[PDB]
């Protein structure tokens, strides 16, 4: 049974998502797409921060814990939130028009190899196959951000208490509202997707470190990307 509190949490996370996700940048053009896609990701980081600030209990963390959680999660949340614009019709992110339509070729021209891109595309396909409710999608984004196992977290106990309330809200939603048999081990498959995102984060960091030790490539980034993903 979904408590008043649990429904309040879902309503809040749905509105936060609606306020910060909508399918100004340098134009789309092996690195030709890095200016455009670095701008897109930079913008997307700002929106992830916007979403995070509206997660019930996130405000009650120290500024230091908020920073470490957003630094560690930002790329995972961007990959995860991108699933809504992703289409299996052509393995592309279709943000409206052919201008802002991104296939394997496009996202392969921002200095990352198929060693990131191929798992990234397979992750989007896997996530489409789960066919999540938007309620489940936004809880998963919130659980992704507020995880007590991120490096540097000071108050793990408060982060864990917040993530446990979100997790309990998700498990309860799945049992009460997700149709069986689609609900069977759905919580476990969602947590596995979070593990896939940590793996994608690891591969991204490794490629980011290499790419961004080429100053000509670092030059094409944004100040926010350099602050969040590092120098």
């Amino acid at each position: 049974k979904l408590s008043e509190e649990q429904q309040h949490i879902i309503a809040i996370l749905l509105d936060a998502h609606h306020k910060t996700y909508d399918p100004d940048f340098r134009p789309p053009v092996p690195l030709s797409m890095l200016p455009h896609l670095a701008d897109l990701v930079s913008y997307s980081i700002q929106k992830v921060i916007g979403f995070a600030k509206m997660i019930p209990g996130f405000r009650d963390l120290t500024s230091d814990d908020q920073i470490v959680l957003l630094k560690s999660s930002a790329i995972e949340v961007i990959m995860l939130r991108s699933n809504q614009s992703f289409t299996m019709d052509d393995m592309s992110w279709d943000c409206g028009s052919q201008d802002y339509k991104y296939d394997v070729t496009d996202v392969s021209k921002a200095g990352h190899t198929l060693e990131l891109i191929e798992p990234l595309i397979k992750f989007q396909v896997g996530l489409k196959k789960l066919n999540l409710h938007e309620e489940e999608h936004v809880l998963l984004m919130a659980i992704c951000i507020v995880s007590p196992d991120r490096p540097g977290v000071q108050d793990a106990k408060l982060v864990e208490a917040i993530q446990d309330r979100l997790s309990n809200t998700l498990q309860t939603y799945i049992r009460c509202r997700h149709p069986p048999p689609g609900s069977h081990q759905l919580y476990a498959k969602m947590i596995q997707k979070l593990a896939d995102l940590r793996s994608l984060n690891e591969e991204h960091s490794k490629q980011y470190r290499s790419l961004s030790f080429q100053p000509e490539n670092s030059m094409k980034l944004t100040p926010l990307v350099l602050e969040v993903f590092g120098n």
């Binding site: 908020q66 920073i67 957003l70 602050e227 969040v228």
Partner: peptide, 10 residues
């Protein structure tokens, strides 16, 4: 060390 993040969090 993260003034842009800090600013966006405010």
């Amino acid at each position: 060390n993260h003034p842009m993040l800090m600013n966006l969090l405010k």
